[PDB]
Amino acid sequence: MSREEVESLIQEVLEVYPEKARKDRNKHLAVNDPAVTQSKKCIISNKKSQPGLMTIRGCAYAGSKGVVWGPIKDMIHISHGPVGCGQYSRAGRRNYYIGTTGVNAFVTMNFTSDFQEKDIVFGGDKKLAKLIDEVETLFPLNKGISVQSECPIGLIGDDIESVSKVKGAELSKTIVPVRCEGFRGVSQSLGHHIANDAVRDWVLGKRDEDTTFASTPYDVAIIGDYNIGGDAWSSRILLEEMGLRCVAQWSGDGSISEIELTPKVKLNLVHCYRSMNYISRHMEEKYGIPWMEYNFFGPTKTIESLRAIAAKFDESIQKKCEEVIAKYKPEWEAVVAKYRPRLEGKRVMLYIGGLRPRHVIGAYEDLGMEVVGTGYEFAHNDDYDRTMKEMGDSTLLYDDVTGYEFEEFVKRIKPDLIGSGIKEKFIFQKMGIPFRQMHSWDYSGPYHGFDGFAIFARDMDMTLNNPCWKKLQAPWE
Amino acid sequence: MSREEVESLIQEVLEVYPEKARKDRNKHLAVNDPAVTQSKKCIISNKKSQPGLMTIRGCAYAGSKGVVWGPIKDMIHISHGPVGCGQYSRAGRRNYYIGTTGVNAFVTMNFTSDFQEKDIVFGGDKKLAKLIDEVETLFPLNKGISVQSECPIGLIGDDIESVSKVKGAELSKTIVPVRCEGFRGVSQSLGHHIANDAVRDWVLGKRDEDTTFASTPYDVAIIGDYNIGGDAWSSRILLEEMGLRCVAQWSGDGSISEIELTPKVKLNLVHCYRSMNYISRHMEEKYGIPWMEYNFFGPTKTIESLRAIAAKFDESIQKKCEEVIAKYKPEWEAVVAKYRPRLEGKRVMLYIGGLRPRHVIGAYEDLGMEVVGTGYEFAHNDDYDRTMKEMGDSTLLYDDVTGYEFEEFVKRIKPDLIGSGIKEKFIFQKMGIPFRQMHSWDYSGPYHGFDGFAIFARDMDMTLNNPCWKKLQAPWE
Amino acid sequence: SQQVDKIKASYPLFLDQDYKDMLAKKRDGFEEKYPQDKIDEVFQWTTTKEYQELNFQREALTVNPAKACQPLGAVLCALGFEKTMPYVHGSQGCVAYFRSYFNRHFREPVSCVSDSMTEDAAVFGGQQNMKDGLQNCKATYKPDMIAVSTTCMAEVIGDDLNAFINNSKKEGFIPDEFPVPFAHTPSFVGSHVTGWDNMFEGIARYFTLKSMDDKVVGSNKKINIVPGFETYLGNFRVIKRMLSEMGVGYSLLSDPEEVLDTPADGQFRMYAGGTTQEEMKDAPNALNTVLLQPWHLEKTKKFVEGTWKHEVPKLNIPMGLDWTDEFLMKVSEISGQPIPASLTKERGRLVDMMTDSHTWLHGKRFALWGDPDFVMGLVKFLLELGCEPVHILCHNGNKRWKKAVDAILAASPYGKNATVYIGKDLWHLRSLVFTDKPDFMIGNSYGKFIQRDTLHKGKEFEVPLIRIGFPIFDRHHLHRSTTLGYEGAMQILTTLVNSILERLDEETRGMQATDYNHDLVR
Amino acid sequence: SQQVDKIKASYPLFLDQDYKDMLAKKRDGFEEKYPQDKIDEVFQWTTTKEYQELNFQREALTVNPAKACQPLGAVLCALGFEKTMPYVHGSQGCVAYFRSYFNRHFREPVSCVSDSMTEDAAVFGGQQNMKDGLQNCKATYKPDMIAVSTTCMAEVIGDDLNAFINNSKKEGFIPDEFPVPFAHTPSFVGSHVTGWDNMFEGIARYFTLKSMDDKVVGSNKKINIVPGFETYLGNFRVIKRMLSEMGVGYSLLSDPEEVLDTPADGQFRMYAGGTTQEEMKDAPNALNTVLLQPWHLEKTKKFVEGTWKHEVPKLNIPMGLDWTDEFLMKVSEISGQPIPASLTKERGRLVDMMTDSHTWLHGKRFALWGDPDFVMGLVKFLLELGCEPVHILCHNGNKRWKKAVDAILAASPYGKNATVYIGKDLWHLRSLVFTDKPDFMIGNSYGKFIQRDTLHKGKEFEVPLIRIGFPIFDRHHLHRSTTLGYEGAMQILTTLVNSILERLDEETRGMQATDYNHDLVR
Ligand code: ICS
Ligand code: ICS
Ligand SMILES: [Cl-]
Ligand SMILES: [Cl-]
Ligand SMILES: [Fe+2]
Ligand SMILES: [Fe+2]
């Protein structure tokens, strides 16, 4: 489609809306021009969702509890408030870890204060203090507690900070109050920021006066990899084969100690910019630790990232870098040789959260595929600035896309594959469009790194080329 | 029911038959009088079945391959002829064993010569010789082969004895020809006899000149226990706790060597009279080994049997006998205390093969139950002689009962439980009568010995008293 | 590394030696992990009666609940109406979760909107969100009805749904006669099933309260059927099938079976099937109203009895033999239709199956959980099968319900070793299956973690999960199954007996060790 | 010993130490058993390619066949006719086995008589057995039809069924008008399916050969349906259901679904349901005759084509998506009835399930066996699911059938690694699943022993059995299932994907070892 055709598509779709919604949505839909560097000339983002339009977004609790805190394996995270939020988010996100669940690790469990009417009317702080004692009795090997606030907590004027200070002192335990109530912000995004600030304020400084950790010149942290299906492990392996020492993973398979040790590293390696840029900036400000963005999706990006990381160290790491690249060359070349001819020329539309809608484009291109539309639930304009150079001219961009818009865009564009989430999957399959989940990896992965690219390629092919797709039309019409 | 009522029941039932059948069947149906000791005044048995009347009987191959030979675990038994017989009888009978199946033991496997038209037309002896070589190659740890003849073998004039002699000499292997074709005799019974004679003629004399076996005064063999659900093991244990040494089990969990060692024992303990009286007689005649009948169904019979067996040995065995009886007293007493109040006064009709229709009566009586009718598929008059003193006055006896007869008898008598086989089970359940399989133990057991009685009691109770039986009548009818 | 011909996903990739070594180095270098001996010691302690006692003394902490929140149930109820959009007034994060939770269970689209209230609404309330949200929803998604419930923010702030909807109509944001039934659905009261009751009663009120003067009980010759919160397609289907076979005129009120099972034929259908507005308007003219899940339809019952004047029968959920019999006999009485030969035969086939399978079911011990009516029906059928329902857990159950279940247990000798637990969660249940080990669990996917825990103690302590309930996320298409009626009983019986036999086969598969009992025929 | 409140059956009784010691003593004293190292050595050898080569060179020995004999199929065919007694002329031992084999699969009574020929009949033949047998059977069991087949003794002696039955009528043993259709069913030709074909063709001849003069093709506006040897009740039921939904007049010729599923209501029903004599007599007036399982209906086909002058269509068994589509389109063409919305929607629901489950099915490798039509339909549907049917075994298959399956494999890239085997047995299959290990077996209960064997090599080598076929003796009520049509495809899909997910859960259940991948949601 031409720029003019895509502009026309946008206007046609926007016709359904009442005027206020129409005027708003027009600002969140754009035709890419990779020549633009300031996305604030092209698209608005990180604003409220319009009521009644079926946004795909979540809330700040999802961004804090679901995304940042929940993966930390040896802490207990309390979903503080009524029963729903913790139950719907129990083990929905595949933030993988090694541990003994219910004993030393707690990630897939749902701990909650299960607010009842009396808790709303009189406050939950007394219940929270009692709950903490019960956690300590029944889960003695927990290494810290977080309190993930749900909507009612701030609305009723509870003081979880006081409870966390008093109980944390009483028990000589890190207890972290997190004001991630879902009424705050507009999406998962503010939850990330809130969560980062809570790590800063209650965990990260614990070892500021401790000189016992033996650092090396090659110490790094992986910042913003939540280890979906093992993604952080298939990243870590490469960094360490390159000669680095990965002191911490934030927060996939993460432990409280490795978070506390992170101020000792030489370089912070940021994968998810959106979720963790906050604490990365803090660590630069406070500890002098530099940070850099990288991308481990597909061989082209992974090779570029390894080289750019290695360049921050000495010749010995740059030599190991080239050894790693040489080792994996035949492996990813074999993946491309098998799958690229099966996928060449195929067109994909994506819709994901705050990173992947741009970050995975290179991996598609390594299989000869074309990303013809992309967009984000909750990205900010700094994300869009990074996107416009990664997407082709005249491709479609959508911020906080409505259900209606996504369906109508897909009907016109007729992509060969869609990559989005669980609420989207079954819609598009019924339309006869191959769909891959690009949050959960459709229960597959990892997709990061060289080993992840093999699985990514296998997966795109198994679904795009599946025999089921030729069968939706009954042969009698 | 009175004697006259049972007599007029028999007459009413027989009115459906054409004259020839009516006259025959009249001879096979009787009202017990326990005062009689010559059953040949009372009932005819071991005759042909009348055509078209739905006998429950099998054939001589069932009695040889299925019953006597099949259980012998370290031999390979060939179902020689077309594919049906070996397939229907594959692992149908729960003759338990310890072994590595397909390697050193072969019981639940189906080896066949799978006769085709050319084999019928030109004979199967060349195929049999080739089959033997193939068995030797693929199953090198087999310790002998039997050839279980199916209907066509004798009809077409094959000479399996020559093949067995020639191949046995060539291979220095025991290969046993068994002329158990289903056209022979009238039932499973002649199969037992044929099988016993084949053991005599081809296996039992191997060690006649071998004096190396370390014999003791306490050596016995269990003759005619096929270890259904482990029945022979729960018998053996008691015999050995009593200080005896069980050199052989014929043939449940039986090995070829233990069969060959049997002529070295001091006493043959016969459980199944019908199937193995023949070889027991031969062993007394040839080797001077005495034999005695016993009964391990229920505590009363088991205690009587242990005492009667011990009385054949010295004071040390008699003393151990009383120790055994004292050991198990509290165990069976607890079983009675729990289950007899659940079963007292309940009436049972049985129909089984050649032993159990009399042998289990004592066990039922140990639970307060009454056997009001019994009968056999293929018993002889010597079995009926042993039955009439075990059954009550004016009870019903049926030899080779027809399906029609069994149904009509049950409709009038209205037993609380029926104990019979798989072809009977589902008929009686639909009539709302609790049913227990008394061949396969309904996939339960063992039933022999003290440990077996506990399971027998549990089983009769779980079925007779099951809540399902109150539910057959819809509440609107 | 990967071999292109046999690519490994996370399992078993991370078992490769290089990944194993890397993970050991991570642990040792940076995780400051408790020693394995201490982990084992603590695990062992969590399996004990001493731990169970501390566990059952909890007052403030909930761990691994077996319930969800009200608006989830309101959304399901709403989905069952023709061309109806579920709309949850309040916070949008909730709607992302409700949709996803159902998407994962049904493997279908789940359509629901929010009006995206934010922190700013704490000052003034959510009135403008309701005005724009209703207008936007109607224009964009073209529903014929919008069924409104609430998230907990809206309840805490105290938004008056009725007034806000009235003002939306007054000011022209949606037409005066466009149906906008509503219910307050606070997540801190009851559970998801309560939300269903509240939503249904709101819809019932909307269509009937003001129009009662022309209504005559029995005049339409039908029976209304209210299914409650129901997540098996087969359950809506079997009820309609049985009533149709009997020639009974009926109206199923809330019927999502079409919208939760659209064909993949090249188009997306946002709406399909459902109870019509005409059916809801005409419902007071029925002979009567039958509640399939009465233990979460208490508000609905008061409205139907108080306003429609229907003499709602005292019927249990139609699960198992006796309660399906009772349901059919009562429907026959009300409708005047005899129970037909087809259903009599189906009943007899179930009884046949019971007689065929009783020996393997007898005395088998189960732990089980779920919503109150499902649980009590499962208990009843287990007793009919000669099974022992020893741990009966209903997190969202109440004292009156528990008394009813205890009375059912009392009417059978198979109830003698059973206890009913209300307000307890799956962490409580975990202790019970260690300290008083049953043969099997019957429950939802969250039970898999209990099975996992039990295996870790040892194979001889493992309690296998049989998946019946909601949500079931780790198997495919079990939502097509049936648990009600004779068909449901047949399905449950079959699943139970074969789970028993599968486990027995596993235990007897060991060559020359336990395979003496590896029978071909069972 | 036993403890009265927890009685042990054989498993685990014989694991008690006293029984273990006793069994060790028995072995050591008297069994002269091969040393365990030698047993282990030989077992290992039986898993090798070298052993496989020797195994595949067999010419004379068959081990663990996957077929039965002709009269078994004649009996099942006969059961499908109203008030019809199966009667097998020959040896009674055979009838005990046929009845028990079916009793164990259906868990139902199976009525069949013999005429109890003995050795004496070799001199003189079985004529008198037939005379008394027919008279006795008619009098005692009051069938309206007796359908006669043969055991191998009768075939070898050369008894002329036709003459014997004619002489039975001539001499007054049964009325001249009483129907006694017959077929010769030698166990040494073909298999059980051949017996079905022979029996059916004999019944068809009996009712039609001599009365063709008044017949006009299409005059009754129906389609005849011949199911062949079929042991899933769901398969008779689904075909009738689909044809009824389409408004197609039909006659299902041999329909045992009622007699194999009578209710447990306090009476035994020897006969129930079945194809009527009137339906067989009128069958030449149909538009056409459709064979559901053509690869074992070749004799039937020649009769229907040659005598009834029906243009039997070239249709595969209606299994999977494509072949169900083809069946329905052909039935539409013949009948003039359009395919109804209900079936179009059902099709789309199957396709939806395929889209939902494809990622777990993709590339999964299967060994499978059974009868020829069932096997080819299973292969086809596996290809449609993106699965690889790598070992395809049909003991009773023929060369022409193999060519047809090889062509189906060629039409799909998912057939690339597949081989079809005819004449080979489950001992051959055992080697294949060691040397070229698939993910699962799909087969009958005899497969359990192969799974046992594979586990003994090691857990990583275990090939789980998925039970689909005949006979299934070690699970309850699977005979109620469906494999034909969209309903059958939905059932098979569900069973396959959940078998995959059950195994994955087992492999990922290990605490801190493999449970990183023990996902709640799949
Ligand atoms: S954290 Fe973010 S929505 Fe950066 S909230 Fe979301 S596991 Fe997405 S595009 Mo789910 S900003 Fe991670 C994300 Fe990306 S949960 Fe995962 S897939 S890379
Ligand atoms: S051998 Fe006989 S029919 Fe004595 S052929 Fe039969 S395992 Fe029966 S009453 Mo099945 S003379 Fe044994 C018997 Fe009894 S197979 Fe078993 S139960 S005690
Ligand atoms: Cl968990
Ligand atoms: Cl075997
Ligand atoms: Fe779906
Ligand atoms: Fe049955």
Distance, CA of D357 to CA of D386 (rounded, Å)? 11
First vs last C-alpha separation in chain D: 46
Please answer whether residues A311 and A318 qualify as being in contact, where contact means their C-beta atoms are separated by less than 8 angstroms. yes
Cα(C364) to centroid(ligand 4), Å: 29
B363 shares a domain with B278:
no
Nearest one of B425, B410, B403 to C356, comparing CA atoms: B425
The two most distant CA atoms of chain A are separated, in Å, by 77
| D81 plus D195 within the same structural domain | yes
Q: Round to whole Å and give the CA distance between A11 and A5.
A: 10
Instruction: Say what the alpha-carbon torsion angle A159, A164, A167, A173 is, to the nearest 10 degrees.
Output: 180
SS3 content of chain A, % helix, strand, coil (to 5): 45, 15, 40
Residue A324 lies in a domain: no
Closest residue in D to A233 (Cα–Cα): D516
Radius of gyration, CA atoms only, chain D: 25
C77 & C203 share domain: yes
Torsion of CA B37, B41, B43, B46, to 10 degrees: 90
Distances (CA, A) of B109 to A220, B73, B369: 62, 11, 39
Cβ of A272 closer than 6 Å to ligand 1, yes or no, is: yes
Residue C520 to residue B91, Cβ atoms within 8 A: yes
- Same domain (yes/no): C457, C403: yes
User: Is B304 within the bounds of a domain?
Assistant: yes
Q: How many domains does chain C have?
A: 4
Hey, what long-range contacts does A325-332 have (CB within 8 A, 24 or more apart)?
A327/A241, A328/A299, A328/A450, A328/C1, A331/A450, A331/A454, A331/C1, A331/C2, A331/C4, A332/A299, A332/A450, A332/A453, A332/A454
DSSP label at residue C35: P
Query: Are D296 and D250 contacting, i.e. CB atoms less than 8 angstroms apart?
Result: no
Burial status of residue C153 (CB atoms within 10 A of its CB: 0-12, 13-18, 19 or more): buried
Same domain, C272 and C131: no
B280: in domain: yes
Please state, in angstroms and rounded to a whole number, the distance separating the CA atoms of residues D57 and D60: 9
Per the CB < 8 A criterion, the answer to whether D289 and D330 are in contact is no
Chains that touch B (3 or more CB pairs under 8 A): C, D
What one-character DSSP code corresponds to residue A257?
H
Q: Which DSSP string corresponds to D70-127?
A: HHHHHHHHHHTBTTEEEEEES-HHHHHHHHHHHHHHHTS----EE----TTHHHH-SH
C363 chain-B contacts, CB cut-off 8 A:
462
**Backbone torsion region of residue A220, taken as left when φ is above 0, otherwise alpha when ψ lies between -120 and 50, otherwise beta:** beta
- C9, β-bridge pairs: C12
DSSP annotation of A200 reads I
Domain boundary among the residues C162, C196, C214 is at C214
Residue D412, classed as helix, strand or coil, is: coil
Residue nearest to atom 15 of ligand 2 (CA): B67
How many Å apart are CA C439 and CA C391, to the nearest integer?
11
Amino acid at A285: E
- Strand order across the B396-399 sheet: B29-31, B396-399, B370-376, B347-350, B417-420, B435-437
Asked which of A202, A234, A258 is the last residue of a domain, the reply is: A202
- Report the SS3 class of residue C113: strand
How far apart are the C-alpha atoms of A153 and C446, rounded to whole Å? 27
Angle made by CA atoms B80, B82, B88, in degrees to the nearest 5: 90
Give domain status of residue A302, yes or no.
yes
Same domain, D94 and D194: yes
Integer CA distances (angstroms), B276 to B77, B189, B199, B292, D93, in order = 19, 10, 11, 12, 21
- Alpha carbon distance D176, D165 (integer Å): 10
Residue C520 maps to a domain: yes
* Range list of β-strands (E), C64-215: 84-89, 113-114, 145-150
Q: How many CB atoms lie within 10 A of CB A136?
A: 15
* Amino acid symbol at C481: S
CB pairs under 8 A between B and D: 326
Q: What's the CA dihedral at B366, B371, B374, B379 to 10 degrees?
A: 20
Length of chain B measured in residues: 477
Secondary structure class of C108 (helix, strand, coil): coil
Amino acid present at B144: G
C-alpha pair distances (Å), A42 with each of A17, A19, A26: 21, 21, 11
Q: Cα–chain-centroid distance for residue D399?
A: 20
Q: Using an 8 Å CB-CB cutoff, list chain B residues near C511.
A: 100-101
- Among C174, C189, C214, identify where a domain stops: C214
Q: Are B151 and D151 a contacting pair at CB < 8 A?
A: yes
Cα nearest neighbour of A98 on chain C: C23
Do B114 and B53 belong together in one domain? no
Check D344 against A474: CB less than 8 A apart: yes
Q: What b-and-e string marks burial along B249-268, b requiring 16 or more CB atoms within 10 Å of the CB?
A: bbbbbbbbbbbbbbbbbbbb
Mutate to test the pocket of ligand 1, among A186, A226, A277 (most ligand atoms within 8 A of CB): A226
Catalytic residue positions of B, numbered? 59, 62, 93, 192
Q: Which domain holds residue D82?
A: 69-214
Domain boundary (D187, D214, D241) is at D214
Protein residue closest via CA to atom 13 of ligand 1: A353
Residues C343 and C249 in one domain: no
Report the CATH number that the domain containing residue A471 is assigned in CATH. Answer: 3.40.50.1980
Q: Does a structural domain hold residue A322?
A: no
For D455, the token pair is 């586990």
**Which ligand lies nearest to the CA atom of residue B380 in the structure?**
2
Same domain for A69 and A196?
yes
Cα–Cα distance, A411 to C428 (Å, whole number) = 50
* Residue B468 located in a structural domain: yes
Same domain, D350 and D497: yes
C94 is in an annotated binding site: yes
Return d(Cα D491, Cα C308) in angstroms, integer: 43
Q: d(Cα D211, Cα A146) in Å, to the nearest integer?
A: 88
CATH number at residue D305: 3.40.50.1980
D448-457 and D426-435 helices cross at what angle (nearest 10)? 30
- State residue C477 phi and psi, 5-degree precision: 75, 15
Annotate B332-370 with DSSP letters as a single string.
Answer: HHHHHHHHHHHHTT-EEEE-BSSSHHHHTHHHHHTTT-E
Catalytic residue list contains D152: yes
Q: Is A225 buried (19+), middle (13-18) or exposed (0-12) by CB count in 10 A?
A: buried
How far away is chain C from the Cα of A332, in angstroms, using its nearest Cα? 9
- Which residues neighbour ligand 5 (ion) by CB within 5 Å? C 107-108; D 352, 356
What CA–CA distances, in Å, run from C233 to C105, C224, D427, D499? Answer: 11, 19, 43, 22
Which candidate, C166, C161, C209, places its Cα nearest to that of C184?
Answer: C161
Q: Do the domain assignments include residue D479?
A: no
Residue C82 resides in a domain = yes
State how far residue A449 is from chain D, nearest Cα, in angstroms: 19
- Classify residue D469 as left (phi > 0), alpha (psi -120 to 50) or beta: left
Q: Quote the CA–CA distance of D62 and D26 in Å, as a whole number.
A: 32
Report the alpha-carbon distance of residue B276 to residue C55 in Å, rounded.
Answer: 63
C-alpha span between B95 and B226 (Å, rounded): 6
Q: What is the 3-state secondary structure (H, E, C) of C279-312?
A: HHHHHHHCCEEEECCHHHCHHHHHHHHHCCCCCC
- Beta-bridged to residue D138, according to DSSP, are none
Q: How far apart are CA D43 and CA D41, in angstroms?
A: 6
In a domain, D38, yes or no: no
Strand partners for C225: C252, C290
What lies within 8 Å, CB to CB, of D172 at 6+ separation is none
Cα B346 to Cα B414: distance, rounded to the nearest angstrom: 11
Residue A93 known to be catalytic: yes
Residue A336 in any domain: the answer is: no
Q: Which domain holds residue A310?
A: 203-317
User: What is the CA angle C125-C141-A53, rounded to 5?
Assistant: 40
Q: Which of D339, D414, D521 sits opposite A92 (nearest CB)?
A: D521
B224 SS3 class: strand
Does residue A118 share a domain with residue A26?
no
The tokens describing B299, both together, are: 């505590």
Q: State the ligand closest to the CA atom of A101.
A: 3
- Residue C114's DSSP bridge partners are C88
* D103 touches B90 (CB < 8 A): no
* Resolution of the structure, angstroms: 1.4
Cis peptide before C179 (omega within 30 of 0): no
- How far from D31 is each of A35, A275, B135, C84, CA to CA, in Å? 88, 72, 21, 76
Confirm if B226 and D16 have CB atoms less than 8 A apart: no
For residues C200 and C243, state if they share a domain. Answer: no
Residue C27 lies in a domain: no
Across the interface, whether the CB atoms of A52 and C132 are under 8 A apart is answered: yes
State whether A198 and A65 are in the same domain.
yes
CA atoms within 13 A on the CB side of D189: 16
Any idea what DSSP says for residue C460?
Answer: G
- Clarify whether residues D305 and D239 are in a common domain: yes
Question: Which of D185, D198, D176, D27 lies closest to D91, judged by CA?
Answer: D185
Question: What is A57-121 written as a DSSP string?
Answer: ---HHIIIIIIIITT-TTSEEEEESSSHHHHHTTT-S-B---S-BTTTB-TT--EE----HHHHH
Query: Has residue D28 been placed in a domain?
Result: no
Same domain, C84 and C200: yes
Interface contact flag, D354 A91, Cβ < 8 Å: no
Torsion of CA A363, A367, A370, A373, to 10 degrees: -40
Distance CA(A323)–CA(A150), nearest Å, equals 49
Closest CA to C435 of C391, C499, C405: C391
Crossing angle between the packed helical segments A449-464 and A299-310, to the nearest 10 degrees? 160
Cα of A158 vs centre of ligand 3, distance in Å, is 29
C49: three-class secondary structure by DSSP: helix
Is residue B142 within 8 A of residue B106, CB to CB? The reply is: yes
By residue count, chain C amounts to 522
Are A423 and C96 spatial neighbours (Cβ–Cβ below 8 Å)?
yes
How many helices and strands in chain C, by DSSP H and E?
21, 12
In a domain, C10, yes or no: no
Q: Is residue C21 part of a domain?
A: no
Nearest to A405 by CA among A114, A36, A19, A28: A28
Residue D435 CB-density burial (10 A; 0-12 exposed, 13-18 middle, 19+ buried): middle
Same domain, A431 and A353: yes
The domain boundary, picked from B170, B202, B234, lies at: B202
Residue C80 sits in the same domain as residue C193: yes
Q: Is residue D223 within a helix (H) or strand (E), and if so which, with residue range?
A: strand D223-226
Residues A449 and A462 in one domain: yes
The one-character DSSP state at C30 is: I
| Residue A159 shares a structural domain with residue A245 | no
Which ligand lies nearest to the CA atom of residue D110 in the structure? 6
DSSP state of D29: I
| Structure-block tokens of residue B450 | 């003290």
Helix (H) or strand (E) holding C368: strand C365-369
Residue for token pair 């020829």: D372
- B329 lies in some domain: no
The CA distance from C406 to C396, in Å, is 16
**Residue whose tokens read 């493999």:** D514
Across the interface, whether the CB atoms of A111 and C62 are under 8 A apart is answered yes
Shortest CA distance to C379 belongs to which of C426, C429, C445, C316? C316
Indicate yes or no: CB of C522 within 8 angstroms of CB of D475.
yes
Total residues found in chain D within this entry? 522
Are residues A111 and A239 part of one domain? no
Size of interface C-D (CB pairs under 8 A): 170
Q: Assess whether D221 and D91 both reside in one domain.
A: no
Ligand 2, residue B192: give the atom nearest the CA: 5
Q: Are A202 and A174 in contact (CB under 8 A)?
A: yes
Q: In angstroms, what CA-CA distances link D165 with A257, C148, D128, D135?
A: 92, 78, 10, 11
D227 sits in the region (left: phi over 0; alpha: psi -120 to 50; else beta) called: alpha
User: Which residue carries 């998506």 as its tokens?
Assistant: D321
Backbone interruptions in chain A following residues (C to N > 2.5 Å): none
Q: What's phi and psi for A56, nearest 5 deg?
A: -95, -5
CB atoms within 10 A of CB B5: 13
Is A88 found in the same domain as A174? yes
**Is residue B350 domain-shared with residue B273, that is, in the same domain?**
no
CB contacts of D497 in chain C (<8 Å) are 476-477
Q: Which of B183, B202, B221 represents a domain boundary (last residue)? A: B202
Overall domain count for chain A: 3
CATH number of the domain residue D349 falls in: 1.20.89.10
* Cis peptide bond N-terminal to D471, omega within 30: yes
Query: Is the minimum distance from the CB of A56 to ligand 1 under 6 angstroms?
Result: no
B65 and B196 assigned to the same domain? yes
Say how far apart CA C332 and CA C290 lie, in whole Å: 12
CA of C89 to the centre of ligand 5 (A): 28
